[PDB]
């Protein structure tokens, strides 16, 4: 998503579902290859501590002035007609400068946007229609004329453009916390293995304290730990070494 070959338009904003895997966000915060990074509700580096159900990434390219419209409680041509956001957005926003990547001498015609719509969009709505936009009481009949214009319009992404008009590969990282189980989590840490010493234990699904030593017990390939007659732990299988 962040390093896609060819991004989609704004009215044709792509969405990629991510789940059932680990997501290392700390590399992004320390990448230093982004013009902006803004996370709503949660810190960007704290994302590695939380777990979610589903995570999407809405990608599109816009001009610099339209970047502020990409937020909850905004208004604009993109905030209304091409990609509208809700009022309770709590995902994240990452901005990459594409003036040297997606810019074209004489404007970039591969990317367009609905500069005209009959009304406003909904949160995370997409409208890929090519209906001629009517503004007056006359009928367009599919063609243009008085108050009848093709709504989609090309972009002026150019080396001549300024900071507020050059392209910007935008990626809005959506999050979901449903009753369904958590499927995406941050990366966990670890350390070396000590023995013959009173230490604390924090295993994958088990904690406690005690001294740890090798043993001759024969665990099964799927067994993680064991308990005694009194339902008390007395053994454990190391998760990184069988």
């Amino acid at each position, epitope marked *: 998503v962040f390093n896609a070959t060819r991004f989609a338009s704004v009215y044709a904003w792509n969405r990629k579902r991510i789940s059932n895997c680990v997501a290392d966000y700390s590399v992004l915060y320390n990448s230093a290859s982004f013009s902006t990074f803004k996370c709503y509700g949660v810190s960007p580096t704290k994302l590695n501590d939380l777990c979610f159900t589903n995570v999407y990434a809405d990608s599109f390219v816009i001009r610099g002035d339209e970047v502020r419209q990409i937020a909850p409680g905004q208004t604009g041509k993109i905030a209304d007609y091409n990609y509208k956001l809700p009022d309770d957005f709590t995902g994240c926003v990452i901005a990459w400068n594409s003036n040297n990547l997606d810019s074209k001498v004489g404007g970039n015609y591969n990317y367009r946007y609905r500069l005209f719509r009959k009304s406003n969009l909904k949160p995370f709505e997409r409208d890929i229609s090519t209906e001629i936009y009517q*503004a*007056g*009481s*006359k009928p367009c009949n599919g063609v243009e004329g*008085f*108050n009848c214009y093709f709504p989609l319009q090309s972009y002026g992404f150019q080396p001549t453009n300024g900071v507020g008009y050059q392209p910007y590969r935008v990626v809005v990282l959506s999050f979901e916390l449903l009753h369904a189980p958590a499927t995406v989590c941050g990366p966990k840490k670890s350390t070396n293995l000590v023995k013959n010493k009173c230490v604390n234990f924090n295993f994958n699904g088990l904690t406690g304290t005690g001294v740890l030593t090798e043993s001759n017990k024969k665990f099964l390939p799927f067994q993680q730990f064991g308990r005694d007659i009194a339902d008390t732990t007395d053994a454990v299988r190391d998760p990184q070494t069988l």
Partner: antibody, heavy 120, light 108 residues
Framework: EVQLQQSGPELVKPGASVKISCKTSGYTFTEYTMYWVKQSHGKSLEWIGGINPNIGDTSYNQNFKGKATLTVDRSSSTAYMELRSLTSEDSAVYYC?????????????WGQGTSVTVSS | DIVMTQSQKFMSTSVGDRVSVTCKASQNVGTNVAWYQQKPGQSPKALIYSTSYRYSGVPDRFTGSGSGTDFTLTISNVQSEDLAEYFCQQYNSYPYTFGGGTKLEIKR
């Protein structure tokens, strides 16, 4: 209260040019389309053209192509009609209008009218 | 362009009488026509749009019917404020072609 106020009556010599204004207040001037018409004395009505303030698209009548041009001033919400090559046939009143398509209408909502007479 | 013909130009109906104003079109205009009301000297105001709907502030006695070719602006209970100039417009193809006009009169 939506209100359209036009200019006063102008006495003009043949061959000259005038500018008829129609100030707008009470609504969003950018979206709604503004028309211009002409009513001669004792005869039927006739339509001249219409201008769109958000874009600038114009579509004049074919009998008024080299007769009238339209300019919109968004800095003060004032439209203008400039008549050229006047003759004795332009002894008429001129109204401004307002389209109503984003309100489930076909409305014109005519203004006041400027009586423009020609004589030497 | 479209030639909107009105016939006749004069009509005479007393108060409390039913009057019908008609005007024809040349080509297939469809549904989108209009009707207006012009007091002598004053500015015209809108009465009926799309031959089935009134405006905000006009009386409910101004009804309209007809489609395609014939259009009729029928008034049930006329008054002294009904005496005006009535025109008909089209909204089908640019440029807009207004009608001829019909003036009302009191019978004597």
């Amino acid at each position: 209260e939506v209100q359209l106020q036009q200019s006063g009556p102008e006495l003009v010599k043949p061959g000259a040019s005038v500018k008829i204004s129609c100030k707008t207040s009470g609504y969003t001037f950018t979206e709604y389309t503004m028309y211009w018409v002409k009513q001669s004395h004792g005869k039927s009505l006739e339509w001249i053209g219409g201008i769109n303030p958000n874009i600038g698209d114009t579509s004049y009548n074919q009998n008024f192509k080299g007769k009238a041009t339209l300019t919109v001033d968004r800095s003060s919400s004032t439209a203008y009609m400039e008549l050229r090559s006047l003759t004795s046939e332009d002894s008429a009143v001129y109204y401004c209008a307002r389209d109503g398509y984003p309100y489930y209408y076909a409305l014109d909502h005519w203004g006041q009218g400027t009586s423009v007479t020609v004589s030497s | 362009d479209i030639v909107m013909t009105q016939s006749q130009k004069f009509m005479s109906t007393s108060v409390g009488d039913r009057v019908s104003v008609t005007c024809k079109a040349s080509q297939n205009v469809g549904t989108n026509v209009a009707w207006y009301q012009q007091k002598p000297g004053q500015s015209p105001k809108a009465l009926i749009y799309s031959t089935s709907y009134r405006y905000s502030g006009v009386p409910d006695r101004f009804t309209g019917s007809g489609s395609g070719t014939d259009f009729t602006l029928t008034i049930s209970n006329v008054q002294s404020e009904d005496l005006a100039e009535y025109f008909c417009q089209q909204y089908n193809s640019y440029p807009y072609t207004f009608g001829g006009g019909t003036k009302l009169e009191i019978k004597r």
